[PDB]
């Protein structure tokens, strides 16, 4: 299926994922298309931070639903 990842600035990215894909796999697909290392990535869905070990189906994230990406450069 397809999901969307949007930054708070407005930039939008499309990803080809499966409901069983983990948030860690999602952050890997983001790096393969944006070059952002996953350690700096913080994914948010409905105000809730997404754990790397969890899957999209754990959060019931449906197709064409939107995840939010904020960067942590520390």
């Amino acid at each position: 299926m397809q999901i969307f990842v949007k930054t708070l600035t407005g930039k939008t990215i499309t990803l080809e994922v499966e409901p069983s894909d983990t948030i860690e796999n999602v952050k890997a697909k983001i790096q393969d298309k944006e070059g952002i290392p996953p350690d700096q990535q913080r994914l948010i869905f409905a105000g809730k931070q997404l754990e790397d070990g969890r899957t999209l189906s754990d959060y019931n994230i449906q197709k064409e639903s939107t995840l939010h990406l904020v960067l942590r450069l520390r």
Partner: protein, 240 residues
């Protein structure tokens, strides 16, 4: 609490509304609907919590036992994995309880998980969600997320399945997601970029009063400011 054929999901298309739902189950390993259940589910936690029930996959090359439940809209044929999120707080008003807002007996209704199980209809719940969203009255929890409590104000009544806010409508739901991501950044100790049009979510170190909006290509506007006044970066005298 318990279950039954009173399932309600939110269909994101072609219905774009709350609809009666179909409960389905697949093998937790091979992701196929070949797993048989020796016993049916008895409560919402049986279908909402992973690996809460066990079965037996009837595939010859799969010894899967974990039951993985999902829901589909029941108002029209759906594909094999065209899922819809189940709204566990919405059920049929079998007791015919009037709405706590409009004082009209409606069906279906949403029942908050407060101590009194207050009942509200979908129309009033829609207006309740929109007004609290536009007034920035939504509550953010580090465990649950961006949600609302019972309309009457009861404690420990935050909605856990955040997909209930799909009743906001397509436009207001994406605004809710945006407001949740913003409040989430502020919850992690971050700050929103004060430069209009940017609105970036920045997570600088706690000690640094310098904030360099900077992420990469289109990820930051490059504006340097102070965490306290949010006007422009300075070395002292944070007052105006």
């Amino acid at each position: 609490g318990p279950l039954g054929s009173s399932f309600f999901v939110y269909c994101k298309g072609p219905c774009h509304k709350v609809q009666p739902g179909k409960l389905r189950v697949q093998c937790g390993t091979c992701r196929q609907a070949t797993l048989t259940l020796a016993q049916g589910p008895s409560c919402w936690d049986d279908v909402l919590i992973p690996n809460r029930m066990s079965g037996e996959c009837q595939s010859p090359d799969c010894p899967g036992t974990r039951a993985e439940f999902f829901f589909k809209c029941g108002a029209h044929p759906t594909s094999d994995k065209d899922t819809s999120v189940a709204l566990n707080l919405i059920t049929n008003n079998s007791r015919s309880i009037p709405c706590i807002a409009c004082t009209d007996v409606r069906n279906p209704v949403l029942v908050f998980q407060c101590n009194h199980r207050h009942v509200i209809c979908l129309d009033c719940f829609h207006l309740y969600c929109v007004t609290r969203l536009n007034d920035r009255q939504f509550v953010h929890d580090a465990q649950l997320g961006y949600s609302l409590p019972c309309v009457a104000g009861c404690p420990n009544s935050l909605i856990k399945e955040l997909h209930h806010f799909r009743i906001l409508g397509e436009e207001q739901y994406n605004r809710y997601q945006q407001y949740g991501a913003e409040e989430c950044v502020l919850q992690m100790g971050g700050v929103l970029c004060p430069r209009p049009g940017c609105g970036a979510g920045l997570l600088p170190e706690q000690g640094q009063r310098k904030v360099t909006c900077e992420g990469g290509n289109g990820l930051g506007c490059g504006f340097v400011f102070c965490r306290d006044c949010k006007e422009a970066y300075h070395e002292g005298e944070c007052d105006s």
